[model samples]
Target: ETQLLKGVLEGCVLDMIGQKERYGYELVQTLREAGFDTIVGTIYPLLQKLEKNQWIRGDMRPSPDGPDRKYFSLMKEGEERVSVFWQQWDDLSQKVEGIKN
Candidate 1:
């Protein structure tokens, strides 16, 4: 169950990135706005692994008000992965919705 939840969180992060490039803090704020109250501390580490795996690419840019921020964007590979994930999620959700009917 914990593993499943972790995957869900990571997938959510990928989905968010798919929508637009965002900094880590921005990602957290978006999650908060979307009603995720508590994010695990492991998110950064997972992001690192994803970058290492070539699933995502990021660059640091100077922020107007603060230190440089790392902004993450989906690479072609990441986009492909996210596309497949989104299709699968939608399919499963439709199935589950039908089940509840």
Candidate 2:
């Protein structure tokens, strides 16, 4: 897999979790709808790292129609991190866009 694409996917995951709490399968489906096709393998490891760093927290909840799901939500640290990341991403995006013009 492409490391660059993986980084992009990680950012997408972070953004999604920032919006609201979500579990693994829900998260995957969200990304798929957003046009991230090859995102299956990358999200788990990224979630692990985010949890390890205290950027996010996961809680297991019993699903209504299936087994338990580990729902993830952004912790205080995660909110801060995602905020900073968005700022940096906006700046970088502007620069890249400028280069194309």
Candidate 3:
């Protein structure tokens, strides 16, 4: 279940971060909206991993409604990763489709 999602989730998360800067909570919500069935806890570790690898950069900024938020943006490495992910995914999808048909 989760393991299956995790296989591809990292790339999706990177793609989203590439779109714009966002916080953890927002990422979780957006993933949910996209039918990921993900939670906040599930997202944090992945974000931590991305930051740890320098794929993404986080900045602490005060929010209007609450405490400071750690907003994330895709780094150059992250963008390259996203491109690789999409290319791999495209190849995989084609193979799967070919098998199906």
Candidate 4:
């Protein structure tokens, strides 16, 4: 479920931001297309949390469709955190898969 996979989502967030800057809503849309089942409420709060942790930073940039967009980008801390997540994910899933099968 969405919450069942809550822990994994943060790593996804970090990986996304690492790829390129993204605006909040559009970022949510991206995840949705990828089967995230995300809502605006879910992502904004997480974005705020990541910003607070220095994992992501937001800045206002001019938008063609609107006044401006608050785009997020990953920081140094974020990259390290995501790297750690990938490491753990590889180990954890291998173990979990064996158990499940």
What is the Cα-based lDDT of residue 64 in candidate 1?
A: 63
User: Residue by residue across 1-101, what tens digits does model 2's lDDT show?
Assistant: 77767667767788899997899888889988998776546678888999999988999987668789999999898888877878878888999999999
lDDT of each: 0.82, 0.84, 0.88, 0.86
Best-matching candidate per lDDT: 3
For candidate 4, list the clashing residue pairs, or say none.
Answer: none
Residue 40, model 1: lDDT of: 51
lDDT of 4 by residue, 1-101 (tens): 46547778899988988888999887898899878764447778888999999998999997668779999998899999999999989999899999999
Q: How close is candidate 3 to the true structure, as a TM-score?
A: 0.87
Each candidate structure's TM-score, on Cα atoms with residue i matched to residue i, is: 0.83, 0.86, 0.87, 0.87
lDDT of 3: 0.88
Candidate 1 weakest lDDT stretch, 10 residues? 37-46
* Candidates ranked, most accurate by lDDT first: 3, 4, 2, 1
Candidate 3: give the clashing pairs.
none
lDDT of 1 by residue, 33-73 (tens): 88777765556787887788888888998766878999898
Task: Assess candidate 4 and give its lDDT.
Answer: 0.86
Better of 2 and 3 by TM-score: 3
What's the true lDDT of residue 80 in model 2?
A: 86
Once fitted onto the true fold, the runs of candidate 3 whose alpha carbons sit more than 4 angstroms away are 1-4, 38-40, 64-67
